[PDB]
Amino acid sequence: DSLRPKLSEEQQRIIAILLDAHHKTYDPTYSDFCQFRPPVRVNDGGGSVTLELSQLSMLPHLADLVSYSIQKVIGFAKMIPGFRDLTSEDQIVLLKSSAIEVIMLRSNESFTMDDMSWTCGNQDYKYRVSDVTKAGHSLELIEPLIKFQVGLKKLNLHEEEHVLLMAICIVSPDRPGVQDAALIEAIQDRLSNTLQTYIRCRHPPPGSHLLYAKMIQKLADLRSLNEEHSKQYRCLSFQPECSMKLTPLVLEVFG
């Protein structure tokens, strides 16, 4: 068959809305980053867990970055066609459960394979593996995260595919605590069908080969990264005075 149906008017509108939503919630110049608590990088070439936890030098800055990003993701989610049709309870459940995953996805835009870092400006706003360990996280999360970023980067997603993937990630019916899974699934299916249709008629080969399957696999990968992040957040939370280095939003989402 190899049918390549055209995007429906609705699907075109959905894509346009998501692109617009992303453009309004993701500043590619990272101009607000100077408003976060300043990044501080202490000497830790040894990757000392003891020293990292005692200082957590990069936590205030990166926690502010994550908090800021969660706010943007909330804004993005609210613009996803159908998201407003869900109960506030389900909206919050989806946002809290997908927050870190969407952050990982959206961060791919600042990630660069030039030096395997998230470059958001001058050296000050260039985040490397070492900066994440300075925030209290370990390689058990960072290494696979980097691998995830590279794999995602190599898919060479169109922005349309990128925003659809984030939307699909958020509107997932298999999140613990969801009430109306059926409605959430209907919304996700509409987005998934849009993505499948877009890839089949807009993505040139050979990058289109099994692209949809590869994208869905990334969503599965995110679940694992989510779980690992939650475990590390727990440990991090055990460190005295940690709450002060976080933010109310971060504490609620991951607490």
Ligand X SMILES: C=C1/C(=C\C=C2/CCC[C@]3(CCCCCCC(C)(C)O)CCC[C@@H]23)C[C@@H](O)C[C@@H]1O
* Residue nearer to ligand X on the CB measure, 167 or 246: 246
Residues 175 to 234 in contact with ligand X, rule: CB under 6 A: 233
Residues 78 to 117 in contact with ligand X, rule: CB under 6 A: 103-104, 106-107, 109-110
Q: Tell whether residue 117 is among the known ligand binding residues.
A: no
Report d(CA 255, CA 252) in Å as an integer: 5
Q: Tell whether residue 61 is among the known ligand binding residues.
A: no
Q: Is 120 in the site for ligand X (CB under 6 A)?
A: yes
Helix (H, G, I), strand (E, B) or coil at 119: strand
Residues 60 to 79 in contact with ligand X, rule: CB under 6 A: 62-63, 65-66, 69
DSSP code, position 111? E
Please give the full DSSP string across 79-100, using - where no structure is assigned. TSTTGGGS-HHHHHHHHHHHHH
Task: Catalogue the E-assigned strands of 92-185.
Answer: 111-112, 117-119, 126-127
**Shortest separation between residue 241's beta carbon and ligand X, angstroms:** 13
Cβ-based burial of 203 (10 A; exposed 0-12, middle 13-18, buried ≥19): middle
Contact in structure between 117 and 128 (CB atoms under 8 Å)? yes
**Shortest separation between residue 11's beta carbon and ligand X, angstroms:** 26
**Shortest separation between residue 215's beta carbon and ligand X, angstroms:** 19
Binding annotation for calcitriol: 26, 69, 106, 110, 137, 229
Binding site for ligand X (CB under 6 A): 62-63, 65-66, 69, 103-104, 106-107, 109-110, 118, 120, 127, 132, 135, 233, 236, 246, 250, 254
